[PDB]
Symmetry: D6
């Protein structure tokens, strides 16, 4: 009989901040402000503790820390947010990014009462794209040369989904 893992969103605590930092060279941001060194992240963190426009969860698999969900650009008048998920290397390969997306959908849609959620992914990532489609995300744009990455401008696909689709299922 196959054993069932338990995957949970958990509100991101300060003690989680080291875990965040060491998920990894590229630009990372906190509240649209960029960081590199731990001291930069930690100070941003305290400056933004009460800020309602981003919310972050750790993904626990069986209580162990496996990755991070960031809801970002939260807007409560237009009832949307963007999300971003990131799975620690030793937790990849086993459907986590998927479950993890379902859980963030659940959070924005059933807890936070947003109307629309979207995400950006590399145009190159035919894998992820197709998964999101599977879950019934529409494609709403192909941003051209939106990111300059490892020496080169890359294209992003923005894909959205809606509260009613979600609750209908």
């Amino acid at each position: 009989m196959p054993s069932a893992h338990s995957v949970k969103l958990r509100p991101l605590e300060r003690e989680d901040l080291r875990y965040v930092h060491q998920l990894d060279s590229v630009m990372r941001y906190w509240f649209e402000e960029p960081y590199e060194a731990f001291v930069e992240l930690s100070d941003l963190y305290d400056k933004h503790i009460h800020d309602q426009s981003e919310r972050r969860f750790v993904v626990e698999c069986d209580g162990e820390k496996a990755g991070l969900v960031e809801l970002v650009e939260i807007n409560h008048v237009h009832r949307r947010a963007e999300f971003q998920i990131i799975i620690s290397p030793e937790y990849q390969g086993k459907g986590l990014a998927t479950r993890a997306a379902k859980l963030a959908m659940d959070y924005g849609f059933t807890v936070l009462n947003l109307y629309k959620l979207y995400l950006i992914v590399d145009k190159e990532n035919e894998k992820a794209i197709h998964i999101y489609r599977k879950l019934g995300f529409s494609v709403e744009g192909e941003l051209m040369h939106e990111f300059f990455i490892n020496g080169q401008y890359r294209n992003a696909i923005r894909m959205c989904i809606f509260q009613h689709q979600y609750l209908a299922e």
Copy 2:
């Protein structure tokens, strides 16, 4: 056996946190640092008052006095028991204690509470304690995907003090 009702101390916050969206002085929290910070910001704020419910010296739940007003002499209260302490009607004794505090110590005139309409047990309990119903608040909360109704119930100091 023994249930006291101790003021909420800063060491109690990690306990509090370890019990859907939560409010401290009407400002929302999720992280423990969010609530901790919020806590010190509202240290001398008289508009809310909190107590750990102690069973035989162990921390077993929480009473909140919220929206305390001394001109109109009223306040709201929420009571929360930890799972492992539920279903011995601490929820009940805690309610009496809250009532004792607000009516005999704080000298309030009126105490009210909100509860999900569906919670027929609580509604019954409080009616037993002689609370009367004053409202059915339609779709007052978005809870886990859905709007829910609450029932608000009150009781008055003269009713209590009949004791």
Copy 3:
């Protein structure tokens, strides 16, 4: 005659102060102007309340308060106050319609509610007409001028507004 809402500027704060005995700003009490100026400065970016001067032909005629605004549960309480001299011209009615408009068509709330004196059978009727539901009768909710009074809480929903 024409009637508009307008965000409340510090310059309006003197006007607000003297509509006449007990009142609040961002839930803290106030009486003197200095008390009020101070709260106002403190709550400049507080999202949980939003105010408006009610303008009647470019003239300050009253005030709309949007209070206890919650965006997760998409609701908010409102209250209107009309300077003595603009009363009895159905102005608080037009102001109500306008506050609904704002919370429903701009703030994107789901539910708006208010509390009035049970005794005010008149206002009560005006709301019922507008399609508001009674959602409760609070007993002795307010000590006012020497006695406890009852109030009625009445609510209306976005979809009812966007329909009719």
Copy 4:
């Protein structure tokens, strides 16, 4: 003819000052800068409340609510009329007004006052308003070279509201 009772505004301070040792929030003042400063320090302090007494729109005196407590539901009041307005029993109407405010607006249970024993007029006035005597405080004040006695008198909300 007309007597209102307006909240004390900052413009009123120069008036206040222009009326032996004075107290603001139990801290003493003499200079106007001493009182002014003190004033802002106690802006959101609910423990005292002040009003100018207005006769036909002119500033004519002062009511102070001091030591306001909402659990025991009581407060003290001092009333001060400016000379040119004395002896028309504004002192009286002012007292009623204070009483009106504390009992019908602020929802206090009990109001008391201190007055020099020797002030037989005030003592009589208040007894007329139905205040009862609760103490003769021996040498409670050093005033102009000498200890003086005060009389403390109270009245209760139920007594007033009989109206």
Copy 5:
């Protein structure tokens, strides 16, 4: 057995917190320790109150509060509290004598006074003995545990102390 007053140190503040339901510091209310620590830090140089641990053979046994201290009128109110386990050994009596000593022979006050429950006929008697005068009976001065209680205010003067 020997009994002393001792100025109250921050280290005593944990002791003070748990003598058991409503209390004050420099006239502001408190309940939680964090609330109390804070007031204490704020009032460090406040001249208007002075506190002391009552030490019984080098052991913390209670507390003396000197409150509403006025130096122009040379008076001050006092209150004593004895930990449950040191009561009924005439300790609050020795503590009273000691507080008088301090206000009279050190602070140079002219008058000291206190307030007790009218119902506490015992304490009342102890003070009368010490030469205290009743200077008033306050009616329903305190809402306590469900009802308004009466209190008695009793005073004594320096010259009476320095004589007897």
Copy 6:
């Protein structure tokens, strides 16, 4: 002989703040923070004076104040920004929004050295859309129900252009 107007971008001064405020009910934002009352705007303004992620110009026509250009979400690693233009009512009807766009293109492209600029407009605004095309903006997405406006979710068209296109002309 037809008289030539002079249209200029001018760096936005504090004294311009009243003009901004009174360009008008809808949500307006300053540095992604929302305002309504003048005191809210003015305080945001001082809080963000040195912030490199938004830049604002007044459009002077013949030295008189005619409208406002906001470059927003400026990113210097991905070399882009979003722009927004707004023409005062008495200056509409006479090609200003157009010239005004050309000028902001010039600023980002020739002064600020961005690589890409884009804009959002109402899907409904077939007029503006076609103009931007005329100037050789590509369409890069149709965001669905992105804004809730006057009681109703509306659709936006994001359209971009690039430094090389611009300098080529």
Copy 7:
């Protein structure tokens, strides 16, 4: 019939500070801290507004500003203070220093409830000394070379009086 002047102590207001400053070269002090320039005095003044250990009155003669009384080193446990009076040049010669002393005695003794007041004066000032005696001040010390003044150490006479003497009269 000779006309009676009215001489009053008045609590020192900030607007009085210029008058103080220009009562005049020597060391002057405010709360035991020294001043020379107006800005020094004014800043000391604000730093010490609530300080209970010095109190200052202006002497009004017929409502016009004639001089200054400083009660200094106020101690409420030992119930004493030192006083110092200073009469503006155009108000000297007409008994003011005297009345002015009586008034400060009245203030400390009948208002402030001190038990003892004293003063220092130049040993050289046989005039003032004898006046204070007249008013029944005892001599309680002759401080030797206590002040270095205009190139030279000078001797001071400290003289005291008591509440009971005063009220007895």
Copy 8:
């Protein structure tokens, strides 16, 4: 052969503050501000660290802490200060107060370059008085009821000495 103790003034460090506090009921002061609880003393201490108008030494006897010298009311224009010495109970009886006075004389006179030092003592203390005389202190005043002490006003004797007397010896 009798063994010689070494008695030294040492600048008072913060760690000395507990020792000070526990030299003992009466009013004690720090920079003319009164203290009782340790937290009061310690906060005064930090508020006054750089203040030139009081200086304090510990008296070490053989390196062990035996008492305290306070130079107080230091005035560098009139070149004087008052001093106060206090010997811990277990170090009394063995000439310390004496040596300790000589050392403070040495400090003010030979290090600090004051011209005059004085002290107050109880009129009742015929012992100390006579010692100071022995060292050639003049008596310069008998302050009457200057201190209210243990229920009663007491009289003080102020006694001074001068740099030239001292260096002459």
Copy 9:
């Protein structure tokens, strides 16, 4: 006729502003409030020093000493004349003045300047003042759509003082 070189005062800022992207203490500005603020932030900063160029008492341009270093004893200078004052070789006299200040007052050893390669006039002027060329900085600035080259030129205190 007369050219002084006055220290830059706060009243001069509106003038400064009224003269592509500008820098104050290596931080960029455009609005006047941006530069004003920046100005006070760098009031006691010794690393840059500024002067208005005064012709017969009127404000006519600007000298900036920038990147001032006292161990290596060097600094950079920019000079800016207002249009209506250009082409009388104030640019020249201003340069001499800068040179006078840095070499005879500030005791610098070396002064250098950057100028667009294309500005053949400036390059010539300075070579005339005996500045020598020390670099051709390739595409050192993006200016109005294009990378541009600058030429850096220096001169030394001993060379100047030969005077």
Copy 10:
């Protein structure tokens, strides 16, 4: 052996302090650690400089400084320093390549430049090899250990990097 850049953490600040006599942080001088700790705290979010520890097999081996970073003109100066004991293993070469990589493939700069002692003919040659151009010779730019020295400024461009 493997070599990486890594953002510089406060924990690295002690390491940085002791590579041996005159140096800067965000253009302000420093000597003592306390001086340095302070500048570092002040410049935490300063975009104009970016630093990195050079790691050799997970071991701290040196430092890369990106200085005078300008994003409008898309350039920045760089400098590398290798702890005494890691020198002469072509490590500063690998570190240079890595700094180019970062400014060119991550920061998206157009131009990177450096300044070396004219006398250092060795380093100079290493850069020329890498495709760097000499863009100037600064005369007596640095007073160092008793005399003014000359320096060379050499630059390279993104397109040259992204090509070869």
Copy 11:
């Protein structure tokens, strides 16, 4: 004509600013008024320097600076500056006498000293006359307008003043 010292008020600070190229306040350099206003505000209670306007018939004529004031060693340096238009009327002489008076008869210093250009043989002579001693010749102490200059340090003592 009559000549007085007068403590320097903020109102004098504009006057001070324009006597014409390098100068200090409480040892920090300044040039612009804003720079100076700031130092002045910072040093309001600094005991180590004391300034005075030199008044000639109630008119501002120059300035006296008392600098490096040390009370333990009882000395202080002084400097005088006279507005162009009041020079050559022996005014700096009367101002010197007055500064001596102040430090000697008011501040109770033991020693006062000054530094002048060796080349200024005139001033030098005026001081010698006043009884000042040369206590040193500092070599190349000042870089001024293009070259290092020598200065002379001359001192006088209280007892010499209080005698003659």
Copy 12:
């Protein structure tokens, strides 16, 4: 054997203190808390610079550069050796080191020192290092009961660099 000259670090303060009236940035200290505080107040102050003198890695003395000025390019220096390290002419090597730093690193033109007239050894040492005498400062210090004379001596960068 080995003498380095390390910058003064905060851990070195307790050492410093453990070496009559002392000055930090011309402000006086005695307690260690007085000097410690003063220390942080002057952390970025360029007007003074300090170094521990290290003999074979142990702390053995102190060089102070004081009154550093970069326009006139001069500074003063005091050197202090701890007793147990005296009389091996570390005082000498330390002096050379100071000289090395100010002249070859800091690019000063001139260095001077003050020493009690009576210290004939120091005076001789420095004259040997080729310092010349520029003043005999009469009663410049009150030291242990008496005014004392100091001798000031300087040397110049060109003289040193002759090396």
